[PDB]
Symmetry: D3
């Protein structure tokens, strides 16, 4: 496809979608066997391998609705991908959401215009695939993680001049901010395929708490395991 140099058949039907291509590399090297790298266009690494005997892929998406939309469109339309699980990070809005919690997004709010252009006059609420959601929830519960299922904000702007509206969204139960889920869920629904976002809380937006990858590595690894485990079902 335009942004992926893989041949037909090189990408598995189940795929994990980290934002960071170097996390795709980490995931492939850490969890998968019989790995190949099928893409390096724009440095946006993608790999296919095997996990507990089942083929699965992992593809960086970049940051933001427009970037992930490019990759998700191509994966679905050109490579026949059927199950897409974003595995990423997010920033907690609410005090009761803690760093290292795992959030499974039921739906996402957004300040993107992408859906207003498609459905003029409507608020489109992008929805996770429930069967994937339940599988991931059950796996995370069994794994011993703190798992929160709820609403997130998909933001276009990481650096917002005022966080007043983000605070207000927190007062309406929104758990955390990230930059991709609306697009993944909307496009998966458009094409009749299955999507989910499983997120590690890496920072808290108002307290200023932050982590390095190493400082959340054990939680992150466990989260990747549940995302894979849902995928292989």
């Amino acid at each position: 496809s335009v942004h992926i140099e893989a041949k037909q058949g090189e990408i598995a039907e189940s795929i994990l979608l980290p934002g960071d291509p170097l996390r795709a590399k980490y995931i492939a090297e850490t969890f998968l066997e019989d790995v190949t790298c099928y893409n390096n266009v724009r440095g946006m690494l993608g790999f296919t391998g095997t996990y507990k005997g089942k083929r699965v892929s992992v593809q960086g998406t970049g940051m933001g609705v427009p970037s992930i939309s490019i990759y998700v469109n191509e994966l679905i339309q050109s490579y026949g991908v059927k199950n897409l699980i974003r595995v990423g990070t997010c920033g907690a809005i609410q005090k009761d959401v803690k760093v290292r919690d795992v959030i499974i997004a039921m739906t996402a709010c957004t300040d993107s215009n992408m859906n207003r252009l498609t459905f003029p006059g409507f608020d489109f609420a992008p929805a996770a695939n429930f069967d994937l959601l339940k599988k991931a929830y059950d796996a995370g519960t069994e794994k011993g993680l703190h798992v929160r299922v709820g609403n997130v904000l998909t933001a276009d702007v990481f650096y917002r001049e005022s966080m007043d509206m983000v605070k207000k969204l927190g007062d309406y139960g929104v758990l955390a901010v990230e930059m991709e889920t609306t697009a993944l869920y909307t496009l998966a629904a458009k094409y009749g395929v299955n999507a989910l976002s499983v997120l590690t809380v890496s920072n808290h937006i108002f307290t200023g708490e932050e982590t390095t990858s190493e400082e959340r590595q054990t939680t992150f690894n466990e989260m990747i395991e549940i995302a894979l485990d849902a995928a292989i079902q």
Copy 2:
């Protein structure tokens, strides 16, 4: 409160919210014991009784976002209600959704302006309480119903001049149309309480299939049972 004549303490902390006040009466008479009627203002019947030994209420909401918003605000703010389950009907958009299916709304799309006014420039995605959702899903699965968990449209207009956008929403996975869920979910989130909508598909919007209450009574009764059963947990 302005629209409910009940005394403090007369309304239980768990409440079912049919749109039709005569369905509130049917639910109270059919399922509850030790019933009183606490409201007849505007004919919008409300009752409190006991189900399997646990106090529970049932309150008509009327049709549309503005009507249900009035009742939900008053129930939460004046009567201390904590768990609110809308029990209603909806019209299927998709061919694969069948009359007599039970839909549990994860989230809702809308053509209402209510949330655009609150969050200018954002799409707010109203979310069910996951713990109530899971309880209802598990109960419905055990009860032997066809249960679908997904997205609905909360419409302001029942009689729409063109159904083009409703069809398009169906192509993006939206299951059915109804007229209340966005408001219930948004206000419950605002006030930190728990909400869910459990819906019976009573009509199919493009095929023209329709039912009378009697023609869906067994399914409807089973749906009320799961809504109660979730409530009493």
Copy 3:
């Protein structure tokens, strides 16, 4: 029709539209002769009788744009209704508007999205039928009421978190808040029929003054008389 169980011909061509179905009952019992009740679906009472020898009906609408839109569509399209007069209550915004004043709405502002969806990019100003307006104005003037003709707000939200915008509308001459007129006027114009809203001020939104039905009964009765009197012309 879907929400009205009347046979063809049972509803008169002129109809009064209170929001409260119990007010429809009061109006029929108090003013009309040879009364029948043609609807009890959803408790939304409707009656037909005679006033000064002329057939006229009265139909509850419920609260909010979506509810009244359902009933008005059905009355016009399925029952051939030609003259529709909402008779309701409203909350004064301005200090110079007093409780027990009668407001005849020339037009209505709104926070509903209903007309933005129909006329994207435009502000649609819904207009009363002038000939009905003049008849009601002349009748109210003769009856000795305080009658104000002007602008109202049709609100989707009764419980608004901030009343700043309602205050601002008052500073631009808007007289009072209610929850139905935009829909009635827009749909009547769509179908080429005649509509008017005649409202009793029952509360003042910033002073906190409020009334019971009994406390405004004489004014309300006189208002119903002028609404009927316009109708029978």
Copy 4:
């Protein structure tokens, strides 16, 4: 003021507002006595004189919401004007509205953003002063004119690429198109003063019928007479 060179007191409290400054000149020369010209800034002629013994003024506004807004703000805020009657032309949308009809605008629709900026999320419906409206209606009825009271469109664009939305507005009862009324009515309401628009239909937008000033001069003169006659009351 910035756009009017008159001294304080030179402009009367009642004023007619044609769009064309040369029509202001025609009105002053044809109907008024003891006339002075108080403004020629930008060629936007303004005059004060006497009609049936009462002082009255006439001020060109130019075309469009932004132009009339400048003049109306200055007249109200700097010159203390209290009664403002636009006297202009319009293009009929509906077949049943005829060239040479006089339309008295109750309210106006618009494609301008002026009120959306002031009342974000709301449709503001600008309203005529009813007492001026009634006076003009009664005077026009007595004068023997065809007078229509209703809704108009205040357009920003005279040359619209598609007239689809204008046709649709006609199907919702909107009588004619012009380019000033929303602004006049909104600003008069803002400042607590009295406004009305009295319009001659000079063209029909879909049939292509058009007139010269001479071809509508008798109707136009009679319309000016009723506008003055209302003003002097």
Copy 5:
């Protein structure tokens, strides 16, 4: 055309567009030879003459997007005009922009709805013709003027209740406020012809500095010279 009484061929292919028709007269009398006046409809003076031997015209536009849009549509579509240079005034927002500076607008921001109606969901950025822009810039630089090339605001409202957003636009580099450029640039682009706006700063919006025409006459004359000089190339 509807608003211009000129015969075909009486208007030159290059035209200057002051907002004030009396400035059109001043420009024609001061700079042009062999002058005729081709329009006095609505007092909106237009002239054709010769400058350094080349035919050129000058046409008042009035104030605001809707007024200039009328004239620009007619000039382009009915009179075959190819090069259109607005020559006007503006109000500085930024402290670093000085009265008597000449601003050449690269593009324009707006609070008009004109382009949102044409391109729903998009921000359209109207662009100057670069070749005209460069010619005017080079001529102004040679003439010894202070020339600033940048962004302006095309406002619908001269009298804005709050200038907060205008200040904010200044903080994002917007140089000055005026009331026509968006329309000129958008329509010229639509029809494939060449437009530019060359503006004299006549007032500073926050400091209150203001000028009479006489107080900026030398700068204004030099600006007209560069606008002509670009035109005749």
Copy 6:
């Protein structure tokens, strides 16, 4: 900063901003001397070196408004960058724009919501720094390139379901589509620094013409040279 691991002082005040980090590497290796790599976070390569003796940097941005906004905010606010030139590719809309043309964006249209959120009710037109624009234009003209200066579309969606609006923008003179310029120009203006986008046309959106990097390498190299050459001035 959060997404760049460079120490203070490691990034030069002038920077080129390709979307593709592998193009940043190509630019550094091909044109610069004394090169270091200061960032590999998320694979988003950044380098500093010397060109004709002057320090300059090159930093990948990723694709889309949200991605470039992250990097531009950090470069300006944390690293003190003053001159930012995006060097990228774009897709021609118009037939008269050819593959291998170089487009210098004066301004950009967008379907992003980023500026509507910042300036509610306004269309913000993001503007290039004119002095950088002129330098690049003069350098490209001297270099013998086909250089077009004009308007572009900054799109959020690469894969748009209908290209109707993109075609319409082409009919209003918009030259090409890309995915970053609105953000770069808006943020540079916000912070008072200098930005420009210099683009190679790599594909034609309606004809289907496309190129590989090798197939446009000579043009691309010349474009990089002019971007550098402007930068070092």
